Amino acid sequence: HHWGYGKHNGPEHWHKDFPIAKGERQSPVDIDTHTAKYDPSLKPLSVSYDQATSLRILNNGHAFNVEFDDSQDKAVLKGGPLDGTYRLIQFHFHWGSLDGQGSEHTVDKKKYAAELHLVHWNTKYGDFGKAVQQPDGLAVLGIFLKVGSAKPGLQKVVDVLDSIKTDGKSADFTNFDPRGLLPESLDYWTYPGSLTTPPLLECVTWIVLKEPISVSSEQVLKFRKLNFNGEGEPEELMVDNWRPAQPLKNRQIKASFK
Numbered sequence: 379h380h381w382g383y384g385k386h387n388g389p390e391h392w393h394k395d396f397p398i399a400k401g402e403r404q405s406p407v408d409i410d411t412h413t414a415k416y417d418p419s420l421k422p423l424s425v426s427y428d429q430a431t432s433l434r435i436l437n438n439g440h441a442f443n444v445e446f447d448d449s450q451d452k453a454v455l456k457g458g459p460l461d462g463t464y465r466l467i468q469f470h471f472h473w474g475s476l477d478g479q480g481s482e483h484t485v486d487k488k489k490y491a492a493e494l495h496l497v498h499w500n501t502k503y504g505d506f507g508k509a510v511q512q513p514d515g516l517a518v519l520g521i522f523l524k525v526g527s528a529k530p531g532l533q534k535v536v537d538v539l540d541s542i543k544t545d546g547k548s549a550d551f552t553n554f555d556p557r558g559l560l561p562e563s564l565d566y567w568t569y570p571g572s573l574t575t576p577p578l579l580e581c582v583t584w585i586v587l588k589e590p591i592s593v594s595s596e597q598v599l600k601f602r603k604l605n606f607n608g609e610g611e612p613e614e615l616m617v618d619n620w621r622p623a624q625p626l627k628n629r630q631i632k633a634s635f636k
């Protein structure tokens with residue numbers, strides 16, 4: 379695709395092809411923890427990932443996605459601020475060239491090394507393509523990564539990155555359990571927002587977990603060896619594939635905790 383994260387095609391350019399970039403409910407945003415409103419009416423999240431079926435991992439030239447079979451209710455997210463059942467379709471990460479940047483959301487302006495997005499769609503709309511046209515179509519769980527101890531359940535992902543180095547490469551990726559990527563606590567902030575890549579549609583209920591997971595320096599190093607470019611093209615490392623924080627405008631961030 380023409381858009382990307384460089385000087386000449388990066389996020390400050392996206393509005394020319396995707397005028398919704400300057401919309402009223404864009405993501406990501408800075409979460410100001412002292413202005414977030416505790417909402418005692420929010421329920422606990424319900425994450426049911428025991429029957430998840432992963433299929434494939436692929437490099438799509440802006441990140442890598444692990445894709446799941448979403449033809450039945452096998453890995454779903456319910457509760458929290460959601461009505462209805464949302465099915466897991468893929469997850470992916472955004473990360474930096476250095477450990478001090480890489481997350482899309484920030485917390486009191488603090489950036490994390492990377493951010494994991496688990497993308498789910500509202501089953502009342504029948505398919506992911508209809509869901510992205512609706513204001514309550516997607517629910518994305520966002521989890522921050524800090525660098526410290528290794529996360530054992532991430533290792534299977536890091537070990538296959540070698541085989542999908544360039545844009546358009548894919549590999550079989552079965553029996554991966556995404557329960558190994560979740561923190562202990564499910565406390566969260568939530569606000570209505572958008573996809574953070576083109577087409578930037580405003581169809582996402584964001585659910586950002588308060589507790590980061592830790593990954594090792596060697597684990598995130600291996601993400602930085604992937605390439606934006608296709609095979610046999612000049613090498614451009616896949617780093618800093620994050621969009622900067624957007625204005626909050628007329629929105630309230632709610633917290634499930636105090």
Ligand code: NA
Binds near residue numbers: 438
């Ligand atoms: Na995508």
Ligand SMILES: [Zn+2]
Binds near residue numbers: 471472495574
């Ligand atoms: Zn993302």
